[PDB]
Amino acid sequence: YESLDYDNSENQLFLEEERRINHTAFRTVEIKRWVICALIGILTGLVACFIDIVVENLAGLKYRVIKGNIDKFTEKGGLSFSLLLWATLNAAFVLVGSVIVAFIEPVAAGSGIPQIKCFLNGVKIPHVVRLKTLVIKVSGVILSVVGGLAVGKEGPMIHSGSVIAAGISQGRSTSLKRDFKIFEYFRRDTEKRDFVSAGAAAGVSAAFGAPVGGVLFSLEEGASFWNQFLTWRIFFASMISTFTLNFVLSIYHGNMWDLSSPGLINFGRFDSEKMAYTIHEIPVFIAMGVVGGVLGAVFNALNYWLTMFRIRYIHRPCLQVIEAVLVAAVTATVAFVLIYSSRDCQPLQGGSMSYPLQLFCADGEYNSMAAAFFNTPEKSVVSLFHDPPGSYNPLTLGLFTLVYFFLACWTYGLTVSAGVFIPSLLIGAAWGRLFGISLSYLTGAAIWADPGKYALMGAAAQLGGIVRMTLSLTVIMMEATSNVTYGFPIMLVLMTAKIVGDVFIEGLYDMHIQLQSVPFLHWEAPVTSHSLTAREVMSTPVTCLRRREKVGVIVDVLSDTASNHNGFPVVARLQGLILRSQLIVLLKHKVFVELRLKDFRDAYPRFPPIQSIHVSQDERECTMDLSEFMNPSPYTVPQEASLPRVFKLFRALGLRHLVVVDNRNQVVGLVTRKDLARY
Amino acid sequence: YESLDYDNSENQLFLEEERRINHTAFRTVEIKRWVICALIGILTGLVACFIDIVVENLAGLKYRVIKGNIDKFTEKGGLSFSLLLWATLNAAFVLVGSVIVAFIEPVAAGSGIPQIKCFLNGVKIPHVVRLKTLVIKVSGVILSVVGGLAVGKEGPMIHSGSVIAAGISQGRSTSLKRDFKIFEYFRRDTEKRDFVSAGAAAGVSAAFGAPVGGVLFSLEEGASFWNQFLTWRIFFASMISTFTLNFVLSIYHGNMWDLSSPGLINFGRFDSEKMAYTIHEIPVFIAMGVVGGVLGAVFNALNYWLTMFRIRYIHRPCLQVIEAVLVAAVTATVAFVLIYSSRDCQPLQGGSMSYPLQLFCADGEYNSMAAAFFNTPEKSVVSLFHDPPGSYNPLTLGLFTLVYFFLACWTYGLTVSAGVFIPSLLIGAAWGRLFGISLSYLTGAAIWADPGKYALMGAAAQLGGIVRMTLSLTVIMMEATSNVTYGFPIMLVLMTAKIVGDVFIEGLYDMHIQLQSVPFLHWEAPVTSHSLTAREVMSTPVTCLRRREKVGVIVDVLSDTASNHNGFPVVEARLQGLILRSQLIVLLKHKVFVRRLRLKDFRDAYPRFPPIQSIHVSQDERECTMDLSEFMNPSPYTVPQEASLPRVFKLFRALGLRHLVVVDNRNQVVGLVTRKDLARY
Amino acid sequence: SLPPDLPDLDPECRELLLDFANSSAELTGCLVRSARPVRLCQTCYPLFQQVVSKMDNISCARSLLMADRMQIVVILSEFFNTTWQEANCANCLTNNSEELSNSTVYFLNLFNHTLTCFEHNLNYSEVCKNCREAYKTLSSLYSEMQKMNELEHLCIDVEDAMNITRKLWSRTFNCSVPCSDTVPVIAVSVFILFLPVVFYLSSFLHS
Amino acid sequence: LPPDLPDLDPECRELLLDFANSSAELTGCLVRSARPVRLCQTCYPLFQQVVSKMDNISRCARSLLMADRMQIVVILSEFFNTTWQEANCANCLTNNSEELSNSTVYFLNLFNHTLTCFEHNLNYSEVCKNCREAYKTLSSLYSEMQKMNELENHLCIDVEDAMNITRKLWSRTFNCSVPCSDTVPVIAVSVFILFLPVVFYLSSFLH
Numbered sequence A: 001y002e003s004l005d006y007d008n009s010e011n012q013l014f015l016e017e018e019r020r021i022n023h024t025a026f027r028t029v030e031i032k033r034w035v036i037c038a039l040i041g042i043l044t045g046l047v048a049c050f051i052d053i054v055v056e057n058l059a060g061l062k063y064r065v066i067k068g069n070i071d072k073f074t075e076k077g078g079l080s081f082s083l084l085l086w087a088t089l090n091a092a093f094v095l096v097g098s099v100i101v102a103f104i105e106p107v108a109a110g111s112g113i114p115q116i117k118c119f120l121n122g123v124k125i126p127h128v129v130r131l132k133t134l135v136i137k138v139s140g141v142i143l144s145v146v147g148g149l150a151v152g153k154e155g156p157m158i159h160s161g162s163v164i165a166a167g168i169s170q171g172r173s174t175s176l177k178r179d180f181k182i183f184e185y186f187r188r189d190t191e192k193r194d195f196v197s198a199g200a201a202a203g204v205s206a207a208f209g210a211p212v213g214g215v216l217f218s219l220e221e222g223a224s225f226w227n228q229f230l231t232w233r234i235f236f237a238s239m240i241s242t243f244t245l246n247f248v249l250s251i252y253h254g255n256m257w258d259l260s261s262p263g264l265i266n267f268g269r270f271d272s273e274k275m276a277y278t279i280h281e282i283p284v285f286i287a288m289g290v291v292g293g294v295l296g297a298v299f300n301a302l303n304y305w306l307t308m309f310r311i312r313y314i315h316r317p318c319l320q321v322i323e324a325v326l327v328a329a330v331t332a333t334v335a336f337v338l339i340y341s342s343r344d345c346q347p348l349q350g351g352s353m354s355y356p357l358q359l360f361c362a363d364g365e366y367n368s369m370a371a372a373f374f375n376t377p378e379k380s381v382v383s384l385f386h387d388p389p390g391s392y393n394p395l396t397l398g399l400f401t402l403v404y405f406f407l408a409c410w411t412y413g414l415t416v417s418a419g420v421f422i423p424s425l426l427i428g429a430a431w432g433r434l435f436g437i438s439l440s441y442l443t444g445a446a447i448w449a450d451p452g453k454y455a456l457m458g459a460a461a462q463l464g465g466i467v468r469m470t471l472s473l474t475v476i477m478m479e480a481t482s483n484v485t486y487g488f489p490i491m492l493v494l495m496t497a498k499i500v501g502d503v504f505i506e507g508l509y510d511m512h513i514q515l516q517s518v519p520f521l522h523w524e525a526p527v528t529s530h531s532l533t534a535r536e537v538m539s540t541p542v543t544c545l546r547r548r549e550k551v552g553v554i555v556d557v558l559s560d561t562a563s564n565h566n567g568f569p570v571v572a573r574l575q576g577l578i579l580r581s582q583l584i585v586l587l588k589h590k591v592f593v594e595l596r597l598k599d600f601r602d603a604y605p606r607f608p609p610i611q612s613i614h615v616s617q618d619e620r621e622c623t624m625d626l627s628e629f630m631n632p633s634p635y636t637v638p639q640e641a642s643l644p645r646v647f648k649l650f651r652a653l654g655l656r657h658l659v660v661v662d663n664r665n666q667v668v669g670l671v672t673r674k675d676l677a678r679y
Numbered sequence B: 001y002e003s004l005d006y007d008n009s010e011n012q013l014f015l016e017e018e019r020r021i022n023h024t025a026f027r028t029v030e031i032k033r034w035v036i037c038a039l040i041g042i043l044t045g046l047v048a049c050f051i052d053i054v055v056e057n058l059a060g061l062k063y064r065v066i067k068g069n070i071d072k073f074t075e076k077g078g079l080s081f082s083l084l085l086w087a088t089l090n091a092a093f094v095l096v097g098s099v100i101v102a103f104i105e106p107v108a109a110g111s112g113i114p115q116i117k118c119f120l121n122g123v124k125i126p127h128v129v130r131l132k133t134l135v136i137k138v139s140g141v142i143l144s145v146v147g148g149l150a151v152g153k154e155g156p157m158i159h160s161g162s163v164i165a166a167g168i169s170q171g172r173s174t175s176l177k178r179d180f181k182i183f184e185y186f187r188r189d190t191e192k193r194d195f196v197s198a199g200a201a202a203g204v205s206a207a208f209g210a211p212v213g214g215v216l217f218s219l220e221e222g223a224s225f226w227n228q229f230l231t232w233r234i235f236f237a238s239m240i241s242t243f244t245l246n247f248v249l250s251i252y253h254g255n256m257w258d259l260s261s262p263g264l265i266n267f268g269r270f271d272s273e274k275m276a277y278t279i280h281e282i283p284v285f286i287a288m289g290v291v292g293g294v295l296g297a298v299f300n301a302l303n304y305w306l307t308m309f310r311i312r313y314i315h316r317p318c319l320q321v322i323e324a325v326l327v328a329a330v331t332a333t334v335a336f337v338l339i340y341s342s343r344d345c346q347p348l349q350g351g352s353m354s355y356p357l358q359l360f361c362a363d364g365e366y367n368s369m370a371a372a373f374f375n376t377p378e379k380s381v382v383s384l385f386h387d388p389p390g391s392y393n394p395l396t397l398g399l400f401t402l403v404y405f406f407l408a409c410w411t412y413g414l415t416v417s418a419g420v421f422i423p424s425l426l427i428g429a430a431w432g433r434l435f436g437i438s439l440s441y442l443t444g445a446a447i448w449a450d451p452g453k454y455a456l457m458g459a460a461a462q463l464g465g466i467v468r469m470t471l472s473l474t475v476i477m478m479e480a481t482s483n484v485t486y487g488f489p490i491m492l493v494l495m496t497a498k499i500v501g502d503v504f505i506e507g508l509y510d511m512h513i514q515l516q517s518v519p520f521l522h523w524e525a526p527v528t529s530h531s532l533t534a535r536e537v538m539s540t541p542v543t544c545l546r547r548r549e550k551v552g553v554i555v556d557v558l559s560d561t562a563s564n565h566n567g568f569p570v571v572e573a574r575l576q577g578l579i580l581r582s583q584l585i586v587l588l589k590h591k592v593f594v595r596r597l598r599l600k601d602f603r604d605a606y607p608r609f610p611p612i613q614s615i616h617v618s619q620d621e622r623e624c625t626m627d628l629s630e631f632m633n634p635s636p637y638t639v640p641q642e643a644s645l646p647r648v649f650k651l652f653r654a655l656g657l658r659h660l661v662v663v664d665n666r667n668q669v670v671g672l673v674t675r676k677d678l679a680r681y
Numbered sequence C: 001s002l003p004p005d006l007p008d009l010d011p012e013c014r015e016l017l018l019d020f021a022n023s024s025a026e027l028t029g030c031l032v033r034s035a036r037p038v039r040l041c042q043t044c045y046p047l048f049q050q051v052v053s054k055m056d057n058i059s060c061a062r063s064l065l066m067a068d069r070m071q072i073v074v075i076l077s078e079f080f081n082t083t084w085q086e087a088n089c090a091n092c093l094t095n096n097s098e099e100l101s102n103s104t105v106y107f108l109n110l111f112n113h114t115l116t117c118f119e120h121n122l123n124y125s126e127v128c129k130n131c132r133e134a135y136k137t138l139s140s141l142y143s144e145m146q147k148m149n150e151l152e153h154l155c156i157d158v159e160d161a162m163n164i165t166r167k168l169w170s171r172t173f174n175c176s177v178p179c180s181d182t183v184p185v186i187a188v189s190v191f192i193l194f195l196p197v198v199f200y201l202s203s204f205l206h207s
Numbered sequence D: 001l002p003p004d005l006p007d008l009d010p011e012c013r014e015l016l017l018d019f020a021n022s023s024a025e026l027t028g029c030l031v032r033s034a035r036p037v038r039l040c041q042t043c044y045p046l047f048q049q050v051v052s053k054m055d056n057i058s059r060c061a062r063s064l065l066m067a068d069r070m071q072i073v074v075i076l077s078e079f080f081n082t083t084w085q086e087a088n089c090a091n092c093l094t095n096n097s098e099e100l101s102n103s104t105v106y107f108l109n110l111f112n113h114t115l116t117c118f119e120h121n122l123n124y125s126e127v128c129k130n131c132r133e134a135y136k137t138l139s140s141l142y143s144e145m146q147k148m149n150e151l152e153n154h155l156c157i158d159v160e161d162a163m164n165i166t167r168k169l170w171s172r173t174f175n176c177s178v179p180c181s182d183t184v185p186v187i188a189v190s191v192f193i194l195f196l197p198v199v200f201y202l203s204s205f206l207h
């Protein structure tokens, strides 16, 4: 794992080009960023529209075929053969969607939220923003939602928008050998991390209909200095993506004048009279946050021990395709078993089923366990919300909730592309609704005991107990419900669920980051670590170069095979810092004492190794002056600076190599991400 | 003007303090920040509720006295006495309100928003966060609004919440001379700027019902590194503020479980399906942003020249009182002349006029120019958004929009506590409704040309053109209209308004900052600035101190009476650290001359440090030394002298610094950057 | 022997549906007959109260009321209630819908006297003179009852009468007040608007 | 007096008293065909003539409809149209509301046949035998009409009430049920699939 070099060099070639660009009148590299942020938002909204349309048509076809087969063998009596169809139809879509993740690109597995959360921190997962990853993740999340797994499709929209963002901003393909002569200025890691931040915000905004929650998501992960123009561009892209999704889906729904679907999930309207809360049920919400904190801890611990089994045993690509197919057949079978043995029936209440399956009901009514399945989980989240009381049976809703918990915990580390927000919101709104049935039983039909109000708090509690998002998730929940007064009980519930969750276990997104062993700087230094200085956490025998260094020892430092370093201060008073990629581009063009920033950005993705460049014996005795190619003002800390002081220069102004100096300006020690996340 | 000193020293007394409070059984200090922020939110919400109830009951009594005499003399004759009564009542309330700002505390004049932007930027305006400043701004807003001025009350909640947040964060009242010592740790100005940010955000959320707009307001100002738990505490204080206002106003109005008043102004709800927008009126929205930018530039130019007239000629407090009285008298007469001469009558539908005048109307009808006045401007804004088409005569709104534009521009620089958000929204919703009446006439009453929707876009356009804030104003408008899809045209309109307005003149808050010579720092380096280096920005001769030197050098450096510097790098001439003036005064008052001096001894005189004139050292004390090792900042931030100006400006701004030491190729101090050399460009 | 209420009703509940159908057709025809001269809250206030009694005598409730997705008796009683509380006919009735209250019959008496005094004095110069005091005491009583309601719209029966009287007095009679009051308003307005230029010149010159 | 202010024009009082006559008739028709829901087939000419009598006044339009804050002739016609749209009586009528459509008159004749067979076949086992063949074609014709009117996008209330009575009489109160023993093959395929994960997890753990 390598870091991205987000801090610019500001060398002589940087200063010479920024003078050349501000001599051509009406300097235009700033308007290009606005064009790119608009295109990022438009394309993220279009990919969300493509996923939504394809998933609803293919799921419509599959459930229509399965419904037509249950209806045929109902009174004839061959319902064993109709379990075999739905087990096979789930297994066939999950087979195709798990081969393309396990055999072609395994970084597409799961949601890409830990990987983009690691990219905005500053490590590069190796294939995270390639075009092949985008294609596989979009086709795989479609094939895994159609394959019937206990998953969602909103989580993978963050990674898709970030890949689009890193793709169109470069003006190159890099997989197709296309060099468009259009931008060429944005091919550094500063611009890329800024645009991927914009694309991740656009992905959140398309997923939930929450643009400001997407902006706050991008500001939490990627916790930098305040940049007014970047936050304004990110907000611009986020609004563009919400509007583009809504506008193309309203054309497809046949109206175009009702901009009514801003996200991929739409919580509805909470301005009702039954939806109002009072101050006396604030500790009821605190108790629900306690319950959501302890169930998310059980969810995370059972998934930790399930992930630990799989890394040691189910880790061959053919062996993890077979696991996903079996989970698909078992979800089909457990759904059919709960549907078959269910007894409550129910008539239509205005499109509340959309595949009304009469199995054994009384010819005007329909099987209501079959309506908990056979729906999208989004429609089930919206229907546990907003329904009038008496709409659910406590036995069947309680038995659906218990089963879906283990099905969604057992479907998270599978080798498919898949989200976990919508399973968490469905688990929480289900036991949130059941808490409302008991409240409406123990107090009579009181107006404040509306069970659709408690599904919201329960969904917030379970989503906060599994993944411990507080500030962005409160704004997402408050912005999807269109009610600003709900953010006070929602934020109390999310505080309580984070505290009660963090006492037990780490949290689902951080836990897989920790199991994949990436460095991953946190928000602050650890609490019992204020007594350390910089001289404890630093790398003390620093390998250095000089301003006028001989060439035969530059190639000797870069060829060591035990000390794979990428940052070299050039000195022994500190004069600056040079990178490994720059000083390989210096040796390729033979820049000796025996280049105008186009060349240091020409070979920019995947710089060549030192075992690809041939220096003759006569050229190992000449000199390479590094004085105009080095970063002349690197960031330094004194040797006595405390660890919270050096943690916050590193994380905020996102650094790669931090030099520790004496009071003689003598280089003693070097600080990077590994030296500074191991405490 | 001085700076905050927001960066902690982290001297050996600070390390001793943290190490000592970390060995106790339980560390309570992070939990105390949460109860301080909850109290900040509760008290900000209660101050907003007090202002709302008192303005409602005082202005309710005032218009009944005026309506009772307009209705009395309208058939017998004598309507000039009702004009004299209304001008005299306005003059009396604005007399009392302006005499306590002009003579007692002049810094409470206007809204507190430029002063709070300067405090979050790191400038100390000498009275901002102080108990006498609070009680005159709270009472002066009531007397400014009840006295009939073309102002709003929602604007100065930000300064009120900021003063509450800076006052209760200490357990000490420096005005009433009491000390209930509970919050001694937080007397250190790193905490104080972090608490004022939460109080400003709570003021924004109690003003508009927009909590995320408060957090984004106080993140734009105070543009620091990302602090996750500070931002989460600010969001906590902001939510508690809007909830406290909504809960106590629901108790006051009856129907306790009807939480329908999140802010002091409530835009209503915009899901009526006549409010929906399309994609082809996106360039119609861009055209309104051009109009808002041009009209806001006109507004700011007229207010600039009026303010430049008032600096030179109307600066005695008595003349400022007379000027405030004459504006309040003229506002009554302008309103009365437009009510008297108007020939527009309409019957009442429901609660629509709230003090109707059947002046010359036909016994079941009421005067509609009398309903543009005699209402709260919040009610005029809300009615301009949600009334059906055909509810406004174009000539009536035209004359009201024309005279209220010039009344609001003439009232802003007065020596009263008063906001300008609500007059800007009312100006813009007024011509925005006229522009929807014009589009509904050309298209033959099309459904997409609903004029209430265009009142909303024009209000945002005018508020963008007058004060040129984006990204905080955009989220406030999204969160008050309760509509996510509206944030796309509102963002487009605010972009267009800011871009069109910036080519003529600065924003109103920026103009009132720079008219009073405040060393204010913008978000980045001005134009190109990579051609300008750190060597050419900073002060080239630097007065330093040694680590262990005689105090006669200390007294002579501190009592120069021609420079008045507050930061001194301590050297050998290699840099060793940084010592302040205040710390050095505490080191001189106690006779710490060459371990019984803990870090609580620097927080004893913390707002008011004594001058060097209060320290008396003898001829024998001047010859002994003072080892500045335990007390200096052992690691100040430092740039080399070849550094670019954006690399200098970004480091200084994001850390809240007030001293940045410029250094050699060795560790030898060659310069110093101290906030006015970054603001001279 | 098909079971009761599945194909058709038993005659103990059928006849009860029939005499709900009797008094509900009388009330609808009364609402249309006494509609434009709005005598609604006084012509058939007893026809409304017999409907509420017949709606109480059906509580065979699960037979008639709640047996279908289209509950005709329920929606028709909701329509009659929504008409009755929007017309505010409780203001025209005294305490328990026995007869008209004293205030409303006094107002209708004054309205009858006002229209007869209009009719007697029938170029409407004889109308504005000699009939003004009846209009003034009528408007004073209307304002008194309108404030008496707001302490606790009026009844539509008296609001239409005042609407007829005001629309008759304002237009097609053109009665009005002369109100020669423009000149002192001009004087006091020009005197106050001239104070800012005096203040601004006097502060500019003396400096 | 002037016309229309305290009273009505004589060519306007007659057009209110005929709309009063047909509206009482329509209200009585609704409540008499309320619970055995014969609504859309009994009350269609009364509804059409109420619509025609309003069209003959909206073509003294200014003197009846737009003359008060409460518009009795408007709100009662709008109530009739909301009743007519919510019943979906246009499904029961053919093309121009002249007579009952062929689909509904054919459906309502099988409903009579099915109820006569229910009556003649009166232990409910002789009912379940010999009459499952009529319930089957009745339910299939109902599904045919339901998808047929879905080819235009509830059905008519006249046919939904008949099918509701028939299903409510067949499923409960006759308890005609189909046994359909299919538990044993369903359990055996359920246990076989749920045993595949423990085989996969053990055989990958041992190997």
Ligand SMILES: Nc1ncnc2c1ncn2[C@@H]1O[C@H](COP(=O)(O)OP(=O)(O)OP(=O)(O)O)[C@@H](O)[C@H]1O
Pocket: A001, A002, A003, A004, A538, A539, A541, A542, A543, A544, A563, A564, A565, A566, A567, A568, A569, A656, A657, A670, A671, A672, A673, A674, A675
């Ligand atoms: N020039 C150097 N001299 C000595 N130690 C170094 C040098 N550069 C890095 N290290 C140390 O090498 C160890 C491994 O980090 P590594 O060398 O991979 O970092 P890097 O190449 O600077 O960047 P990255 O973290 O992105 O890989 C750390 O302890 C780091 O401090």
Ligand SMILES: Nc1ncnc2c1ncn2[C@@H]1O[C@H](COP(=O)(O)OP(=O)(O)OP(=O)(O)O)[C@@H](O)[C@H]1O
Pocket: B001, B002, B003, B004, B539, B541, B542, B543, B544, B563, B564, B565, B566, B567, B568, B569, B658, B672, B673, B674, B675, B676, B677
């Ligand atoms: N110790 C110092 N030696 C020399 N020049 C200094 C020193 N401190 C400040 N200056 C410079 O003196 C000028 C006046 O600033 P001033 O002395 O008021 O700064 P300060 O009090 O240290 O900081 P501030 O006023 O911004 O809080 C500035 O150009 C500043 O850079």
Ligand SMILES: *[C@@H]1O[C@H](CO)[C@@H](O[C@@H]2O[C@H](CO)[C@@H](O)[C@H](O)[C@H]2NC(C)=O)[C@H](O)[C@H]1NC(C)=O
Pocket: C066, C067, C068, C069, C070, D160, D161, D164, D168
């Ligand atoms: C079929 O008949 C049943 C009763 O026999 C109807 O049930 C009632 O429906 C109304 C309106 O939906 C509810 O308010 C009542 O509570 C229901 N009563 C009972 C006892 O369930 C049902 O609506 C009819 N269905 C159709 C399609 O007409």
Ligand SMILES: *[C@@H]1O[C@H](CO)[C@@H](O[C@@H]2O[C@H](CO)[C@@H](O)[C@H](O)[C@H]2NC(C)=O)[C@H](O)[C@H]1NC(C)=O
Pocket: C159, C160, C163, C167, D066, D067, D068, D069, D070
């Ligand atoms: C008084 O009478 C006038 C008409 O003479 C009423 O005005 C009507 O009001 C309704 C809605 O309130 C409109 O739909 C009509 O178009 C209006 N009529 C005309 C001719 O414009 C008025 O409502 C009456 N007032 C009261 C209190 O009943």
Ligand SMILES: [Cl-]
Pocket: A151, A152, A153, A154, A155, A156, A418, A419, A420, A421, A422, A423
């Ligand atoms: Cl998801």
Ligand SMILES: [Cl-]
Pocket: A111, A113, A155, A156, A418, A419, A420, A421
């Ligand atoms: Cl996810």
Ligand SMILES: [Cl-]
Pocket: B151, B152, B153, B154, B155, B156, B418, B419, B420, B421, B422, B423
């Ligand atoms: Cl304001």
Ligand SMILES: [Cl-]
Pocket: B111, B113, B155, B156, B418, B419, B420, B421
């Ligand atoms: Cl303001």
